[PDB]
Write a protein that binds this ligand. Structure first.
Ligand SMILES: Nc1ncnc2c1ncn2[C@@H]1O[C@H](COP(=O)(O)OP(=O)(O)OP(=O)(O)O)[C@@H](O)[C@H]1O
Ligand SMILES: [Mg+2]
Length: 290
């Protein structure tokens, strides 16, 4: 830490506080996260080689006196803040599409190396002035554990959690990050979270009320999951024309496949990049005021 000057406190999250800092020798402006168990050091160290332009770069790992400091590339804004700033107008569709496309490329890269994010959400999607968007904190949930409250006792967002996780599947796949991104895609288009649950049962029941209570027809094996109960109410599925209205039929087809109940059938990131929705994809630059 003596090599870094804390410029400001950016925020705090699940695992610790994040500061904007300046490297006192390289001159570099970085984001410093102050979070050590053996398995986590090893796991965090492999993240250093998972480099991709749509993944926030992990520059260095500082393990000192029982404390762990992760040094990241710094981006000027997160997607929650961008959404809140664009609320009156909504993010134009071409930027939504470009962002979704780029995040899918990030996901196909990590997923092809068998690494899952596990906790995608707007705060973990960072943007710059050029039109790029990157996934932040990739791999940290597996490296450290995912607590019900943050280190600041603040609540864990359930809004983007895939239903297999909520139903108690222990070994879920890379399909959980596709569910999350699907949820974030719907939220960019409508300017409202898709499933804002405020407890596990609330989250699950918000899914069931839009997508229909899953059964053995749509998801073979669902009724035998750990937290599955035969007493769950039976709600009908709703039309995506009603769920994300402005979106065209390519968008709606892609989103429903990203929200498939059965994780084995949900589209993978690589097939999603070939969907017809991305046929006219471009890379606009956002209106960003730093
Ligand atoms: N590399 C980074 N560059 C710039 N700002 C960042 C960076 N990483 C995190 N921040 C921002 O700082 C704030 C704190 O992030 P942090 O990761 O602690 O919590 P979170 O993303 O909301 O939750 P989680 O801890 O589960 O990731 C968030 O708004 C995040 O957007
Ligand atoms: Mg984060």
């Amino acid at each position: 830490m003596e090599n870094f000057q804390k410029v400001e406190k950016i925020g705090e999250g699940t695992y610790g506080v994040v500061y904007k800092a300046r490297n006192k020798l390289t001159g570099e402006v970085v984001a410093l996260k102050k979070i050590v168990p053996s398995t986590a050091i090893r796991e965090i160290s492999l993240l250093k080689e998972l480099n991709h332009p749509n993944i926030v770069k992990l520059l260095d790992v500082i393990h000192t006196e029982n404390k762990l400091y992760l040094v990241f590339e710094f981006l000027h804004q997160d997607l929650k803040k961008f959404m809140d700033a664009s609320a009156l107008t909504g993010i134009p569709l071409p930027l939504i599409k470009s962002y979704l496309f780029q995040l899918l490329q990030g996901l196909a890269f990590c997923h092809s190396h068998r690494v899952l994010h596990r906790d995608l959400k707007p705060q973990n999607l960072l943007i710059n002035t050029e039109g790029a968007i990157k996934l932040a904190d990739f791999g940290l949930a597996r490296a450290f554990g995912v607590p019900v409250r943050t280190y600041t006792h603040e609540v864990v967002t359930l809004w983007y959690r895939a239903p297999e996780i909520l139903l108690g599947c222990k070994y879920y796949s890379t399909a959980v990050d596709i569910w999350s991104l699907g949820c974030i895609f719907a939220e960019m288009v409508t300017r409202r979270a898709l499933f804002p649950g405020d407890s596990e049962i609330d989250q699950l029941f918000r899914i069931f009320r839009t997508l229909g209570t899953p059964d053995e027809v749509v998801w073979p094996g669902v009724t035998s999951m750990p937290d599955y109960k035969p007493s769950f109410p039976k709600w009908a599925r709703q039309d995506f024309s009603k769920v994300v209205p402005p979106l065209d039929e390519d968008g709606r087809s892609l989103l429903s496949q990203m929200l498939h109940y059965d994780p084995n059938k949900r589209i993978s990131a690589k097939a999603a990049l070939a969907h017809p929705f991305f046929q006219d994809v471009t890379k606009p630059v956002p209106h960003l005021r730093l």
